[PDB]
Amino acid sequence: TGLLDGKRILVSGIITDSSIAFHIARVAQEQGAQLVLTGFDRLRLIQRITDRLPAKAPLLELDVQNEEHLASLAGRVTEAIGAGNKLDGVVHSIGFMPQTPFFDAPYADVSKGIHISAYSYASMAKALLPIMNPGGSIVGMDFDPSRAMPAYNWMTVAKSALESVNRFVAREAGKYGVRSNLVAAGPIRTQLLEEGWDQRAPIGWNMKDATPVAKTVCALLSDWLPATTGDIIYADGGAHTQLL
Amino acid sequence: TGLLDGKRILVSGIITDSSIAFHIARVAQEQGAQLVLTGFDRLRLIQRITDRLPAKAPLLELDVQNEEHLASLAGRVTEAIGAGNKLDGVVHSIGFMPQTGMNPFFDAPYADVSKGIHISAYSYASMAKALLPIMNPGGSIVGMDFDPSRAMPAYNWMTVAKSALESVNRFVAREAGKYGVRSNLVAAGPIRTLAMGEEAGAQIQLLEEGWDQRAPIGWNMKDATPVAKTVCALLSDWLPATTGDIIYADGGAHTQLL
Amino acid sequence: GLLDGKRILVSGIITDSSIAFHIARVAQEQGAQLVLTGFLIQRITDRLPAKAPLLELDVQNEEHLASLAGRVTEAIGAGNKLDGVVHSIGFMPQTGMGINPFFDAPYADVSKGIHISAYSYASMAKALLPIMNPGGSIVGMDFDPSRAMPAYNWMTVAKSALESVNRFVAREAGKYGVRSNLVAAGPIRTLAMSAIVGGALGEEAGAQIQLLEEGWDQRAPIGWNMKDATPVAKTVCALLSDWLPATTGDIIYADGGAHTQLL
Amino acid sequence: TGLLDGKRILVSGIITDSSIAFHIARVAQEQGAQLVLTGFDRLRLIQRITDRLPAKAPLLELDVQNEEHLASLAGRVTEAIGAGNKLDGVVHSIGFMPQTGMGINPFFDAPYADVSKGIHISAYSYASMAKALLPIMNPGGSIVGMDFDPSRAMPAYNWMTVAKSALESVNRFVAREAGKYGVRSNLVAAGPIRTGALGEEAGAQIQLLEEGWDQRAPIGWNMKDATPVAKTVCALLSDWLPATTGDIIYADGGAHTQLL
Numbered sequence A: 001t002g003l004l005d006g007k008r009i010l011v012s013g014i015i016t017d018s019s020i021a022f023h024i025a026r027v028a029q030e031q032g033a034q035l036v037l038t039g040f041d042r043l044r045l046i047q048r049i050t051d052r053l054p055a056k057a058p059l060l061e062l063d064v065q066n067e068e069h070l071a072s073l074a075g076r077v078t079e080a081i082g083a084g085n086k087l088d089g090v091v092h093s094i095g096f097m098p099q100t101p102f103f104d105a106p107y108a109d110v111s112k113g114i115h116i117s118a119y120s121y122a123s124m125a126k127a128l129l130p131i132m133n134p135g136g137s138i139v140g141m142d143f144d145p146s147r148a149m150p151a152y153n154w155m156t157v158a159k160s161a162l163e164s165v166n167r168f169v170a171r172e173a174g175k176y177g178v179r180s181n182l183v184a185a186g187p188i189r190t191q192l193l194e195e196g197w198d199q200r201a202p203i204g205w206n207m208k209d210a211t212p213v214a215k216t217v218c219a220l221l222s223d224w225l226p227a228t229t230g231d232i233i234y235a236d237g238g239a240h241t242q243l244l
Numbered sequence B: 001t002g003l004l005d006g007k008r009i010l011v012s013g014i015i016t017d018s019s020i021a022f023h024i025a026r027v028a029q030e031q032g033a034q035l036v037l038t039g040f041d042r043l044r045l046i047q048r049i050t051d052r053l054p055a056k057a058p059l060l061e062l063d064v065q066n067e068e069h070l071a072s073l074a075g076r077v078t079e080a081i082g083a084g085n086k087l088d089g090v091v092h093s094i095g096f097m098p099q100t101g102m103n104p105f106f107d108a109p110y111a112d113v114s115k116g117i118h119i120s121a122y123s124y125a126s127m128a129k130a131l132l133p134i135m136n137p138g139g140s141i142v143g144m145d146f147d148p149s150r151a152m153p154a155y156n157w158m159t160v161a162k163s164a165l166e167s168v169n170r171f172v173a174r175e176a177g178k179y180g181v182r183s184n185l186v187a188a189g190p191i192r193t194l195a196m197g198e199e200a201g202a203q204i205q206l207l208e209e210g211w212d213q214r215a216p217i218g219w220n221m222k223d224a225t226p227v228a229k230t231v232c233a234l235l236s237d238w239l240p241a242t243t244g245d246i247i248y249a250d251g252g253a254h255t256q257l258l
Numbered sequence C: 001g002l003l004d005g006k007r008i009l010v011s012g013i014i015t016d017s018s019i020a021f022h023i024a025r026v027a028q029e030q031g032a033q034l035v036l037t038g039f040l041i042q043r044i045t046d047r048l049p050a051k052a053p054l055l056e057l058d059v060q061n062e063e064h065l066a067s068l069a070g071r072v073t074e075a076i077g078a079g080n081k082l083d084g085v086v087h088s089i090g091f092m093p094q095t096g097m098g099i100n101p102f103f104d105a106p107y108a109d110v111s112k113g114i115h116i117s118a119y120s121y122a123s124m125a126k127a128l129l130p131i132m133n134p135g136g137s138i139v140g141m142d143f144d145p146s147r148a149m150p151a152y153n154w155m156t157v158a159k160s161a162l163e164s165v166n167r168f169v170a171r172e173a174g175k176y177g178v179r180s181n182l183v184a185a186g187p188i189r190t191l192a193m194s195a196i197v198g199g200a201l202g203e204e205a206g207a208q209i210q211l212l213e214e215g216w217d218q219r220a221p222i223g224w225n226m227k228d229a230t231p232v233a234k235t236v237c238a239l240l241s242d243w244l245p246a247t248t249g250d251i252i253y254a255d256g257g258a259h260t261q262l263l
Numbered sequence D: 001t002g003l004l005d006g007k008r009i010l011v012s013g014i015i016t017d018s019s020i021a022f023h024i025a026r027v028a029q030e031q032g033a034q035l036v037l038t039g040f041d042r043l044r045l046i047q048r049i050t051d052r053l054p055a056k057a058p059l060l061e062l063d064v065q066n067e068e069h070l071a072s073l074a075g076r077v078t079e080a081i082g083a084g085n086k087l088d089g090v091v092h093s094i095g096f097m098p099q100t101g102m103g104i105n106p107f108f109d110a111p112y113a114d115v116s117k118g119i120h121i122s123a124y125s126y127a128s129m130a131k132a133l134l135p136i137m138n139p140g141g142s143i144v145g146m147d148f149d150p151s152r153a154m155p156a157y158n159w160m161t162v163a164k165s166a167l168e169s170v171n172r173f174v175a176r177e178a179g180k181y182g183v184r185s186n187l188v189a190a191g192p193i194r195t196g197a198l199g200e201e202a203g204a205q206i207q208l209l210e211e212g213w214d215q216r217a218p219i220g221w222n223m224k225d226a227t228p229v230a231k232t233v234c235a236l237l238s239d240w241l242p243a244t245t246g247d248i249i250y251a252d253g254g255a256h257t258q259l260l
């Protein structure tokens, strides 16, 4: 009798057992969801990580920069969940920005980072909306980019683009009766900038614990936020609401 | 086996069965919560309405402008739930702006604006001050908001009161955090509640019609259930790292220009 | 000058450290003809580069508000109208800001604070719009209240209300071809502000206010000088000029860019 | 006495006399600024347009996707303004998004090659321009870019809105770098400017979006007139907003502050 009982959910972005996607997958299974997982490049390595989850789940290859992987994705998911079944949820937990810092980054690096971290949220929704049920939910991972900060410079730019992409994805998803939202998380250990979060957060922030973030994603995947779309839910201990 | 199984929750703001608080109370009870209800002024009338809820719940009087009601509130709640028990949730679903403030903008006297701000914004801090000493860690305080980031033809001073409420919520979160309690607002789209000239109504109509147009998933102003479900999500253990914040239950209308 | 020939009303002078004193000085240096309002002040306004009539205005006094336009018309001469209005008025009792806990502020104190700091922006616009020329500009003073901070408490709440009031004032002002905007300044060492740094409110809160102030210069990409009100006064004069003609119901940040940076 | 008397300002983005950059250049010259102009691809065509400005100004070639143009830019500007002189202002009025990413094409049908080109020209180039020109800018200087409020999604604008969201973030980082030189960096978010071609259905949607602007704006909005936008850019180039950086100034009639 779980929050996601009977729901079929695709979870992308597992690379290690410290991945936010690993914790999202674990919490979703504990809550009764039937998962389909996607991985990039190191598929044998990813499969061994997915064996650590409480329940067995099929693992599909997905390089978001590969148009052939995107064109075949819905058919491959349909084979995994069975003909006649559709997804109730999609989790985008993918991000990358080449190490290149701000003025020295060539455009080839920035473009690759934006492709993977922002444009792919639209690519995944385009591929999967035709196999999603009404009342469905698409959730992506964000970090608040409204202010510039030292380090993560071009990744912050990619998150600003992702927030805008999410608002357009919501317009398309709405046609299918599907919601689209981002979870803006505080820093997770997957220094001064990081320590400031626990200081600002009225309820504190534990950088070593991804469970509050995973629970927030599951709340959006559930039927309990049915009138929220094109939006951002902050799972950051309330740090973004406080100056000092 | 409900979302709020075993939780003790105080719900303020029921006046009619169309009240957002009525729907919040109904959904919470369906989800296993044990409620304590508070009403203002028309207590006999409110008891007849709360008799329509799926389960029995004690009804306490609370006028948020009455300092004696606020000073005695925690003791009265403790008596209703039993000594040794504490609340897990608090719902503030209270708002009022006298007619003059809702040239309506320039003609509203300060006495009217001050009363509206007292009831709609300051009282969120008053309720938290009174109830935090009787709230359990992991607890949740939720208030009702209407997005006031942009001015709109009608609502005028009520919009100003909501801007003040959003700021109050951020300070309440600082205090609530000391008790391991979250404080958040639900910004709802327009709902056809009881209280909700020619121009005023025409402005509301256009505002209301644009909302459903702008919302990617649409907006039904006759249905308070999506709003009630969102409040219950915040009262649950499923948004444990969210505080001093605003969750929008508006069909996504605020995220779209046209 | 930037404001050559403009007739501008400036409220909020109490000392020569008042932001309004600096706004008035820069405006006169830029060729504006001023009318001043105060709630002792005549001895301070005598320190400005040019002579200007001083009118009494208690924003909580409805008789002062009802007679204001007539009194301004008498000061500037029949047939003349105002081009600009500056609201540089703010108040919150010590129970609502400083060392007092957020929950311990009584509503009577908060309400007086909101009346003076937010509602009066609408009162002033109501009284003066009938005597303002098209292309006119109303400017108010703000402190970014988007995030909660220590000590500022109910004054931050009053600023959140002021920002909302400004958006509604812009709707009304637009009917007269007048703009309405706020300048959100960084912290300025005015009369009360220097005392807190000195230790007037104690060690614990004095350190917290000092950290809040020091972080500003650290976050600001161009730095922030708390001792200098001139960049703020110049920003207000930019809004009073004809150089931001399509900006209304808005907020211009004169804070060194601190609000755009997290660390 | 002009607002920009004696200031040396670089203005990019002129293609036609309807370009926002044309109006920025005109107002800056009327206010006493000495300009250096940059143009892309159609240099002969751009020269005929810049001949319509009140004063003569050198025109330099600048393709923001060309790293050799960027590497030589500061040296070429120094030659145009004279050795020992530096710039007081820089105007970025450059934007591009292929028809696959903006217009009638569904949001999901824009290929990444087209989106990436659009982001390179419309957002990344703001950082490229600042990197090339900050070493030849005076303290108290000002870098200004053109923006269109992307905080809410809207029909047709699609990936150009995404590019503007990226530009706003780029501006905040450029301000951190510019601050080291005592230089400000800001964007001007303008309302729509007229700078059946796309069909009935989309043509009506774009028209409704445009008409709502004048309705929302408390002081109205004239889509035919770039002068209020050009004046706002000149205010940021002046010494009158000295404590504003990493920020956005809205020259949109106040439309973004009103719901209806």
Ligand SMILES: NC(=O)c1ccc[n+]([C@@H]2O[C@H](COP(=O)([O-])OP(=O)(O)OC[C@H]3O[C@@H](n4cnc5c(N)ncnc54)[C@H](O)[C@@H]3O)[C@@H](O)[C@H]2O)c1
Residues within 6 Å of the ligand: A012, A013, A014, A015, A016, A018, A019, A020, A021, A039, A040, A062, A063, A064, A065, A092, A093, A094, A095, A096, A116, A141, A142, A143, A184, A185, A186, A187, A188, A189, A190
């Ligand atoms: N860790 C934090 O502090 C934090 C905070 C807020 C948001 N986030 C976001 O959460 C998400 C997950 O990050 P994480 O912290 O779990 O790190 P992670 O390194 O564990 O996950 C990033 C994932 O992206 C995948 N990926 C990279 N290139 C890809 C491609 N071409 N195709 C498909 N997938 C690709 C990687 O394989 C990996 O699984 C990202 O969007 C990240 O920006 C992280």
Ligand SMILES: NC(=O)c1ccc[n+]([C@@H]2O[C@H](COP(=O)([O-])OP(=O)(O)OC[C@H]3O[C@@H](n4cnc5c(N)ncnc54)[C@H](O)[C@@H]3O)[C@@H](O)[C@H]2O)c1
Residues within 6 Å of the ligand: B012, B013, B014, B015, B016, B018, B019, B020, B021, B039, B040, B062, B063, B064, B065, B092, B093, B094, B095, B096, B119, B144, B145, B146, B187, B188, B189, B190, B191, B192, B193, B194, B195, B196
């Ligand atoms: N209806 C909408 O369109 C809408 C939209 C967004 C948010 N909200 C908010 O939701 C909340 C509830 O509104 P509603 O639409 O259910 O209206 P409602 O009329 O049903 O409820 C308002 C409640 O406030 C109570 N109240 C007024 N003065 C009080 C006082 N002095 N002490 C205690 N209680 C007092 C009333 O008794 C009533 O129960 C309010 O905060 C309102 O601003 C409403």
Ligand SMILES: NC(=O)c1ccc[n+]([C@@H]2O[C@H](COP(=O)([O-])OP(=O)(O)OC[C@H]3O[C@@H](n4cnc5c(N)ncnc54)[C@H](O)[C@@H]3O)[C@@H](O)[C@H]2O)c1
Residues within 6 Å of the ligand: C011, C012, C013, C014, C015, C017, C018, C019, C020, C038, C039, C057, C058, C059, C060, C087, C088, C089, C090, C091, C116, C141, C142, C143, C184, C185, C186, C187, C188, C189, C190, C193
């Ligand atoms: N750090 C700062 O000092 C700071 C930062 C940002 C914004 N501001 C704002 O700038 C404005 C001016 O503040 P200041 O720092 O110059 O301090 P100040 O004390 O010099 O000015 C406040 C003024 O408000 C006037 N006032 C108070 N009650 C009044 C009433 N009933 N009627 C009319 N006038 C009344 C006082 O006479 C005084 O002239 C305020 O809005 C303030 O919040 C100040």
Ligand SMILES: NC(=O)c1ccc[n+]([C@@H]2O[C@H](COP(=O)([O-])OP(=O)(O)OC[C@H]3O[C@@H](n4cnc5c(N)ncnc54)[C@H](O)[C@@H]3O)[C@@H](O)[C@H]2O)c1
Residues within 6 Å of the ligand: D012, D013, D014, D015, D016, D018, D019, D020, D021, D039, D040, D062, D063, D064, D065, D092, D093, D094, D095, D096, D121, D146, D147, D148, D189, D190, D191, D192, D193, D194, D195
């Ligand atoms: N027109 C509007 O409604 C509107 C509204 C808000 C903001 N803006 C922005 O104002 C700016 C100017 O646009 P406009 O409306 O004047 O249109 P425009 O077509 O007149 O100007 C765009 C300019 O970008 C230049 N450009 C394109 N590719 C380039 C490259 N590779 N290298 C260098 N320059 C290149 C073009 O040559 C042209 O001069 C853009 O950033 C645009 O997004 C326009």
Ligand SMILES: CNC(=O)CN(C(=O)Cc1ccc(-n2cccn2)cc1)C1CCN(c2ccccn2)CC1
Residues within 6 Å of the ligand: B015, B040, B041, B042, B094, B095, B096, B097, B098, B099, B102, B146, B155, B158, B193, B195, B196
């Ligand atoms: C004069 N106009 C209003 O204030 C409308 N309004 C109300 O009047 C609410 C209200 C209901 C009942 C009482 N009451 C008196 C005695 C016992 N109960 C008091 C107040 C509500 C206020 C809250 N709501 C909204 C509606 C839109 C935006 C924000 N808030 C719904 C209408």
Ligand SMILES: [Mg+2]
Residues within 6 Å of the ligand: D213, D214, D215, D216, D217, D218, D219, D220, D221
């Ligand atoms: Mg209009």
